[PDB]
Every structure is written in C-alpha cells, then in structure tokens.
Amino acid sequence: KIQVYSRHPAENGKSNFLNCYVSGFHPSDIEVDLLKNGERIEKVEHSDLSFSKDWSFYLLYYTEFTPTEKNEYACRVNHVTLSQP
Amino acid sequence: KIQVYSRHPAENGKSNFLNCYVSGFHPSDIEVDLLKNGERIEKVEHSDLSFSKDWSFYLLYYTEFTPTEKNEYACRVNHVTLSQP
Amino acid sequence: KIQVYSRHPAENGKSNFLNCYVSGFHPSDIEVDLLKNGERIEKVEHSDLSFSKDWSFYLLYYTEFTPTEKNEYACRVNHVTLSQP
Amino acid sequence: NFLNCYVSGFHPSDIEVDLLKNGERIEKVEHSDLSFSKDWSFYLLYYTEFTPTEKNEYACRVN
Amino acid sequence: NFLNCYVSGFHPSDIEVDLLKNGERIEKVEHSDLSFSKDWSFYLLYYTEFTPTEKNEYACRVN
Amino acid sequence: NFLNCYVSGFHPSDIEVDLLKNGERIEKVEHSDLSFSKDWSFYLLYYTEFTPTEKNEYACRVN
Numbered sequence: 001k002i003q004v005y006s007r008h009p010a011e012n013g014k015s016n017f018l019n020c021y022v023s024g025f026h027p028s029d030i031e032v033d034l035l036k037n038g039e040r041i042e043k044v045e046h047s048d049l050s051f052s053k054d055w056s057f058y059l060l061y062y063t064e065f066t067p068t069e070k071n072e073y074a075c076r077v078n079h080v081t082l083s084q085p
Numbered sequence: 086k087i088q089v090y091s092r093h094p095a096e097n098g099k100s101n102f103l104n105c106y107v108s109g110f111h112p113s114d115i116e117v118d119l120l121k122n123g124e125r126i127e128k129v130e131h132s133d134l135s136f137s138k139d140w141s142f143y144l145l146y147y148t149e150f151t152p153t154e155k156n157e158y159a160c161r162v163n164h165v166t167l168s169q170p
Numbered sequence: 171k172i173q174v175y176s177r178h179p180a181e182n183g184k185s186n187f188l189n190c191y192v193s194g195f196h197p198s199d200i201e202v203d204l205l206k207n208g209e210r211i212e213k214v215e216h217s218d219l220s221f222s223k224d225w226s227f228y229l230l231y232y233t234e235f236t237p238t239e240k241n242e243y244a245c246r247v248n249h250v251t252l253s254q255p
Numbered sequence: 256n257f258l259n260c261y262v263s264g265f266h267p268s269d270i271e272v273d274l275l276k277n278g279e280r281i282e283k284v285e286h287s288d289l290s291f292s293k294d295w296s297f298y299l300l301y302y303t304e305f306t307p308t309e310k311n312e313y314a315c316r317v318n
Numbered sequence: 319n320f321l322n323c324y325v326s327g328f329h330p331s332d333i334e335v336d337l338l339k340n341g342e343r344i345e346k347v348e349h350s351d352l353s354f355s356k357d358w359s360f361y362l363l364y365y366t367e368f369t370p371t372e373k374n375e376y377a378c379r380v381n
Numbered sequence: 382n383f384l385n386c387y388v389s390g391f392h393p394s395d396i397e398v399d400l401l402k403n404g405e406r407i408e409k410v411e412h413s414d415l416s417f418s419k420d421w422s423f424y425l426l427y428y429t430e431f432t433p434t435e436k437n438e439y440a441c442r443v444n
Binding site: 256257258259260261262263264265266267268269270271272273274275276277278279280281282283284285286287288289290291292293294295296297298299300301302303304305306307308309310311312313314315316317318 | 319320321322323324325326327328329330331332333334335336337338339340341342343344345346347348349350351352353354355356357358359360361362363364365366367368369370371372373374375376377378379380381
C-alpha cells in the first residue's frame with residue numbers, strides 16, 4: 001500500500017490576483033438629483049430624496065438560524081487530501 | 086496497491102485573474118433625475134425620488150434556516166483527492 | 171502502509187494579491203444632491219436628503235442564532251490533510 | 256548626413272494617443288484605458304538552447 | 319553628421335499620451351489608467367543554456 | 382559630430398504622460414494610475430547557465 005503525491009511545477013512569470021470574491025451590497029456609479037441647474041424658479045417645496053432606509057446584513061424574526069458551513073474563500077486554493085485506511 | 090500522482094507542469098507566461106466571483110446586489114451606471122436643466126419654471130412641488138427602501142441580505146420570518154454547504158470560492162482551485170482503502 | 175507527500179515547486183516571478191475577500195455594505199461613487207447650481211430662487215423649503223437610517227450588521231428578535239462554521243478566509247490557502255488510520 | 260548603420264529593436268516614434276483633447280462641459284469619464292504597453296523583454300526564453308554564432312563587421316564610413 | 323553604428327534595445331521617442339489635455343467643467347474622472355509599461359527586463363531567461371559566441375567589430379569612421 | 386558606437390539597454394526619451402494638464406472647475410479625481418514602470422532588472426535569470434564568450438572591439442574613430 002504505497003501512495004505517493006509528487007507536485008513540482010515550474011511557474012514561470014508573475015501572478016496577479018484582484019477582487020477574488022466580492023459580494024454583499026456594493027452598487028457604484030449612481031447619481032440621484034433634482035433640478036441640477038435651474039434658474040428663475042419661484043418655489044421649490046416638499047423635496048424628498050431617499051437612497052435607502054435601513055442596512056441590515058442579517059434581519060431575523062423568530063428564526064432558528066442554524067447553518068453548518070465549511071467554506072474556503074480565497075484566490076488560490078490548494079486542497080489536497082490523501083486517505084489510506 | 087500502488088497509486089502515484091505526478092504533476093510537474095511548465096507554465097510559461099504570466100497569469101492574470103480579476104473578478105473571479107461577483108454576486109449580490111451591485112448595479113452600476115444608473116442615473117435618476119428630474120428637471121436636469123429647467124428655466125422659467127414657476128412651481129416644483131411634491132417631488133419624490135427614491136432608489137430603494139431597505140437593504141437586507143437575509144430577511145427571515147419563522148424560518149428554520151439550516152443549510153449544510155461545503156463550497157470553494159476562488160480563482161484557481163486545485164482539488165486533488167486520493168483514496169486507497 | 172507508506173504515504174508520501176512531496177511538494178517542491180519553483181515559483182519564478184513575483185506574486186501580487188489585492189482585495190481577496192470583500193463583503194458587507196460598501197457602496198462607492200454615489201452622489202445625491204438638490205439644486206446643485208441655482209440662481210434667482212425665491213424659496214427653498216422642506217428639503218429632505220437621507221442616505222440611510224440605521225446600520226446594523228446583526229439585528230435579531232427572539233432569534234436562536236446558532237451557527238457552526240469552520241471557514242478559511244484568505245488569499246492563498248494550502249489545506250493539506252493526510253489520514254492513515 | 257543622417258546615417259544609420261544598424262538600427263533594431265523597439266523604436267516607434269511620432270505617436271500621439273489622446274482622449275478628449277480639448278473638451279468642455281463633460282459630466283462623467285469612467286474607466287478609461289490608456290496604456291502604451293505592459294512588459295518590455297528583449298530576450299524572453301523558455302527552455303531554449305540559445306547558441307548564436309556571429310562574426311559581423313559594422314563599418315559605415317562618412318567622408 | 320549624426321551617425322549610429324549600432325543601436326538596439328527599447329528606445330521609443332516622441333510619444334505623448336494625454337487624457338483631457340485642456341478641459342473645463344468636468345464633474346467626475348474615475349479609474350483612469352495611464353501606465354507606460356510594467357516590467358523592464360533585458361535578459362529574462364528560464365532554464366536557458368545561454369551560450370552565444372560573437373566576434374563583432376564595431377568600427378564606424380568619420381572624416 | 383554626434384556619434385554612437387554602441388548604445389543598448391532601456392533608453393527611451395522625449396516622453397510626456399500627463400492627465401488634466403490645464404484644467405479648471407474639476408470636482409473629483411479618484412484612483413489615478415500614472416506609473417512609468419515597476420521593476421528594472423538588467424540580468425534576470427532563473428536556473429540559467431549563462432556562458433557567453435565574446436571578443437568585441439569597439440573602435441569608432443573621429444578625425
């Protein structure tokens with residue numbers, strides 16, 4: 001019963017990693033405006049500019065929150081497993 | 086019972102990784118406006134510009150949230166497994 | 171019962187890692203404005219500019235929050251496991 | 256008497272790359288990519304048996 | 319009497335890379351990329367048996 | 382009598398990289414990237430048997 005794992009690669013050249021895992025709320029490049037350029041305007045009343053009310057990554061009610069997770073968030077993962085019972 | 090894993094690649098040249106995993110709420114390049122350029126406007130009343138109300142990645146009610154996940158979020162994954170019972 | 175793990179790679183070239191794991195609330199490049207440039211405006215009344223009310227990463231009510239997680243957040247993970255019962 | 260006996264390699268000239276040279280009243284400029292090049296490598300070899308034999312005489316005369 | 323007996327390598331000239339040279343009333347400039355190059359490597363070898371044999375005579379005369 | 386008997390290596394000239402040279406009334410400038418280069422390596426070798434044999438005569442005369 002002989003198991004042999006041999007790994008000798010030759011990686012020639014630089015390696016670049018960027019934004020390997022992006023999640024959640026992340027909008028970008030958004031513009032909300034009213035009367036950006038206005039002249040000879042008599043009255044401006046009851047203006048309501050709203051982007052959001054409440055930010056809650058977890059919002060639970062009477063919840064049995066029971067996750068069992070084994071995750072690997074990375075850029076370069078090397079998950080090697082040998083088993084010889 | 087002999088199992089041999091040999092891996093010696095020659096990777097010639099640079100490697101580039103970008104935005105390997107993107108999820109969730111991420112809209113971009115959005116414009117909401119009213120009267121961008123206006124003149125000789127007497128009254129502007131009851132303006133309502135709304136983008137969103139509530140941001141909640143998890144919103145549960147009387148929920149039995151029980152996931153069992155084994156995930157691998159990455160850019161380059163090397164998942165090698167040898168088994169010799 | 172002989173199990174041998176041999177790993178002698180030759181990584182030639184620099185390695186760069188940036189933003190390996192980004193999550194949560196992180197919007198960027200957002201502009202909310204009213205009357206950016208205005209002239210000869212008599213009255214400006216009842217202006218309401220709101221971005222958000224409450225920031226709460228965890229907001230629970232009568233919740234049995236019981237997660238069992240074994241996660242690995244990194245840029246370069248080397249998870250090697252040998253088992254020989 | 257401009258003379259070039261031997262000119263080689265990367266030598267570009269008289270190049271103009273421009274974006275919005277003379278512009279006015281521009282609202283947004285997002286994600287502009289103005290890159291001339293990435294990597295400069297004269298001898299880039301991989302597992303190469305580089306065995307050149309040369310006997311060159313660079314003799315350009317001017318009178 | 320401009321004379322070049324042997325010119326090699328990376329030598330670009332007369333290059334102008336510009337973005338919004340003469341601009342007015344600009345609101346946003348986001349994520350501009352103006353990079354001339356990344357890496358400068360004259361001899362970049364990997365497992366290379368570099369064995370050049372050269373007997374060159376660079377003799378450019380001016381009278 | 383400008384004479385170059387042997388010129389090599391990285392020698393660029395007359396390069397102008399500019400962003401918003403003459404600008405007015407600009408609100409935001411975010412994440413600008415103006416990098417000429419990263420690494421300067423003349424001899425960058427990996428496991429290389431570097432064995433050059435050269436007998437060169439650089440003899441450029443001026444009278």
